[PDB]
Amino acid sequence: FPNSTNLPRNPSMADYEARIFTFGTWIYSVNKEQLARAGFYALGEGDKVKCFHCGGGLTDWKPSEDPWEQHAKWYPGCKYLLEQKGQEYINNIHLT
């Protein structure tokens, strides 16, 4: 943990539409579209979410937080993250 290979930890959540559906009753400020685009889906347990690829989990979100930024901060090895945001983006989140 987390998963840093090229195979998704949860294939059933690889589709954006599948992930966005999990946010049907989302009551938190952090944007659902942004979360789903960042690879996350809701567990239905508070504001807990997990990335379908690396399986990384995030909770206790702040109102203006950026999902992609938190994804890179805690799970830099995620391959979906790499594919979507690039290595420079990730490395910059962990700048000297």
Next chain:
Amino acid sequence: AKPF
């Protein structure tokens, strides 16, 4: 955000 906090990881879990």
